[PDB]
Amino acid sequence: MRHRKSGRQLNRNSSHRKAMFSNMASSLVRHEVIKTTLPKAKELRRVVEPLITLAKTDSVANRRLAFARTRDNEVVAKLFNELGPRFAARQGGYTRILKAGFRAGDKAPMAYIELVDRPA
Amino acid sequence: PRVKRGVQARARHKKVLKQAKGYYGARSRVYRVAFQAVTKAGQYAYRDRRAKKRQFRQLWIARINAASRQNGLSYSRFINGLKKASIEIDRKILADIAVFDKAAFAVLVEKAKAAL
């Protein structure tokens, strides 16, 4: 029935989804703009935007939390050194999804997702 | 000598197919179904050439009855009247008169009434 339920299965196990989103967040922090399928973009917001919020308060605790959720030291550094400071004032909506047609191979609805206020 | 059947075989099939123009589906396209169809059409056509003669006479009688009863006589009494008056106008004509010359029909009815 799925009444009032949240979270897409994305035709995946939980452990896979968790892995996939951890990866995808790392990619988005690293490149600041990522092309994915639109449903994955929409889910990614629920993963990335909380990491950015965490990164607004710099602490050994919070860095370790971010590390736990990303397992990437380059990402954690960029989060706490760059992205947190950037989005300090901003109250949510750190990312932006731009729909971008279909993928050639499977005509999957695709979208760009990017950080807001990219210096580029 | 060896005889190939093609050219004549096709002509037979085509003859039937041409007779089955206008039938639905297979019955106009496919020889096996068309043949059956063209046969039953011939059967019906034989039966109906007979039954046409019955249907038309029923129609006339129905019309003559209408007209006679408008002129105050039953079909059954009108035919007897005419017979007794020695009037030998067919139902096909009577029914034509009942439609196209209502006055004449009334005359015939008046003649019929007198004979009864």
Binding site: L98, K99, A100, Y112 | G25
Partner: protein
């Protein structure tokens, strides 16, 4: 399990009466004048008049 009578072309056609395709919602970008799927970026990277890619 299986048909007892081959289906006519008519009835086959009747089934495919709903098989027709519908077109995409398009729009034209203000700046680039490029047609695009409405709500989607253009091929040149515009969305609602701004270069976003």
């Amino acid at each position: 399990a299986v048909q007892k009578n081959r289906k006519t072309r008519s009835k086959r056609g009747m089934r495919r009466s709903h098989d027709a395709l519908t077109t995409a919602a398009l729009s034209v970008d203000a700046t680039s004048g490029e047609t695009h799927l409405r709500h989607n970026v253009t091929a040149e990277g515009y969305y609602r008049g701004k270069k976003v890619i």
